[PDB]
Amino acid sequence: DRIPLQIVRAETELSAEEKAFLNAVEKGDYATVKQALQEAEIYYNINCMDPLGRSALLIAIENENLEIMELLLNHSVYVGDALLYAIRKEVVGAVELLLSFSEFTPDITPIMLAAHTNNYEIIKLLVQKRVTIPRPHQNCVECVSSSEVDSLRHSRSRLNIYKALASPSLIALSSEDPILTAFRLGWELKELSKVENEFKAEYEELSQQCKLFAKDLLDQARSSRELEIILNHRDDLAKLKVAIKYHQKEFVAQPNCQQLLATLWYDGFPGWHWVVKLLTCMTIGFLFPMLSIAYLISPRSNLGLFIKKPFIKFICHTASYLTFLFMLLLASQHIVRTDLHVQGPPPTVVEWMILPWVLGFIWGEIKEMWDGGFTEYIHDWWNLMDFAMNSLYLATISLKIVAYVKYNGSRPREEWEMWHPTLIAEALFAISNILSSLRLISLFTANSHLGPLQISLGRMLLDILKFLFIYCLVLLAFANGLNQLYFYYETRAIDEPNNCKGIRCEKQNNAFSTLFETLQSLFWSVFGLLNLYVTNVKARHEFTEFVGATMFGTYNVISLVVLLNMLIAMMNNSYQLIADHADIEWKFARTKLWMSYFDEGGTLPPPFNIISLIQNQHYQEVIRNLVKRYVAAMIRNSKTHEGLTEENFKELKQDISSFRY
Amino acid sequence: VMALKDVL
Ligand SMILES: CCCCCCCC/C=C/CCCCCCCC(=O)OC[C@H](CO)OC(=O)CCCCCCCCCCCCCCC
Ligand SMILES: CC(C)CCC[C@@H](C)[C@H]1CC[C@H]2[C@@H]3CC=C4C[C@@H](OC(=O)CCC(=O)O)CC[C@]4(C)[C@H]3CC[C@]12C
Ligand SMILES: [Ca+2]
Ligand SMILES: [Zn+2]
């Protein structure tokens, strides 16, 4: 009825004299400790540990007392890890004095611990002693052997090294240019989280730390000349392009960089109501062909130089695409019309006028791909869409020529086979029209209202496919079951009214007769477009019809009462996390869009497209001042927590006592 | 390995 309590693992008991010694050391009594040390020296332990494991030097370090610390250091030995304990507490005097069971993993070195503490003064003190830190590897024989010998130690050592390397103080102190080092280190740490799945959080935190350090270093500029020097440094805005390559979104979206980019973008438009802006945009767009011919004839003329402005060039490109879409509208109305019975018809007028635009788009896309390379082309999701639409256009053009060559006579439409080339050409043309009209979504990024919504929608598309996978699995299961049940009662087309078979008839029938038809029927029941009498059978077998109706009802419940609402909930959760960063991502996308019109390579719109020492010296001077303000800034920003002035006041009393004796 | 350096 009682539980005894005993000490299962007991340490060596300390003697009474040692206990008094340790109590005197903790109490900070110099006289008693000095007398105890003297009587121990002349009578004969100095290196005893308390149950917590702290030797007398450790308590001296923890008590922030220098006098008895020197007292033991003069008489005692076995410093051990006292330097690490002094560094962790961030005491400058004790660390300097030391330079002049363990709580730490054995691979820790003083420099890496100082980097971990992110103390600039201690790091600077240690660096002057010619210390060095190993460079971690990226897959050799040694790496493999160490992994087999001890995986835990290997991973922990790598993590410790990478935490030491990612300290802002170390980068600010021992790097030629901290901005490029921060960019590269952040990218490398980001790539490491995808390989080391177990420790992903730590690596993402380190990469975020590097990005924040780079942005904060950029934040210290005080004049426009310094900003230009930093942004234009080359090892054209080379630094901005390097930041874009490394996905430095916080760095790029800084207000000063955005102001400079907006100044470059709205050149020739000083002080850019919205109605006046709309009128100016429409007026410039209406005159795009004349500007294009003016640029073609003579770039030296003022009219030729007029299109070189990025904003006017963007307006001209948008106007050209809008003209192409409008002329696509004309074809859909079939103003010219066709006999409909010509098996191969010559192209109408509208098709001839359309033809140059398609060739210009193909030329632009192929030139872009050739210049960028395969990898850059694969990186852009919009480029894939352009490739698909251009392939569809090419297929339509080839099929029209094939149909014209193959056939010479005329025939009524109702007699042609289903795979006639003309029908495929028309279907592909319609699909290409639909795809071409949807390309205007990529222009929403230039608007302050529409652009954030476009970015957020793009960010949430990953999870929708994740749900469509589960929906496809459930649909396949239920389609298999229903087709297995209902395939014994297939009828013929001639046995139905109007000779129509399937669910696209006036009266739906044969809904679950074939697997393809079962999939089509189950797809359309999501929108309530499948009627309920399709579960009936001509033979009137009530058990089979009841089972089929129950299967259909179970599918309806699962698909509409459960999965749709879970999709709603997950979309709600994902959007909230995404919303906190919408502005930064939108501005990153917008500055990506702006920079594509800065070059002079593609000035012509698509229809007409067919016809060094002193730099480094200045960069170092600005970097020397940016780092100086950074270390000053975050110390004062860390003074929101500095109430230790009174403890220093006690140090003043101690200095007065030292002057006294 | 990389050697750290600071760049009466
Ligand atoms: C990814 C997988 C997720 C799975 C999630 C499952 C969640 C729970 C759902 C279970 C499915 C239930 C299947 C049996 C009922 C549906 C079939 C049916 O009624 O057959 C009709 C057939 C043919 O008319 O008739 C019967 O089976 C008899 C009449 C049943 C009438 C009462 C139904 C009670 C249950 C109603 C649930 C309503 C849910 C939405 C409420 C807003
Ligand atoms: C449904 C039918 C009527 C077609 C709809 C077409 C729109 C989806 C597209 C066509 C032209 C596009 C516009 C073309 C150019 C601009 C200017 C662009 O801003 C600027 O470059 C100028 C500065 C400014 O006004 O903010 C912002 C997006 C916007 C309004 C675009 C928004 C999307 C628009 C209206
Ligand atoms: Ca492209
Ligand atoms: Zn190696």
PDB file of C-alpha atoms and ligand atoms in Angstrom, chain A residues 365 368 377 380 382-383 386 439, ligand 3:
ATOM      1  CA  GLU A 365       8.689  31.482 -79.142  1.00  0.00           C
ATOM      2  CA  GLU A 368      13.162  32.759 -76.977  1.00  0.00           C
ATOM      3  CA  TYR A 377      12.051  27.096 -71.308  1.00  0.00           C
ATOM      4  CA  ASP A 380       8.249  28.920 -67.192  1.00  0.00           C
ATOM      5  CA  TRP A 382       3.435  29.959 -69.447  1.00  0.00           C
ATOM      6  CA  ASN A 383       6.057  28.806 -72.031  1.00  0.00           C
ATOM      7  CA  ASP A 386       2.586  28.803 -75.655  1.00  0.00           C
ATOM      8  CA  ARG A 439      -3.382  33.804 -72.529  1.00  0.00           C
TER       9      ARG A 439
HETATM   10 CA    CA C   3       7.317  32.389 -74.279  1.00  0.00          CA
END
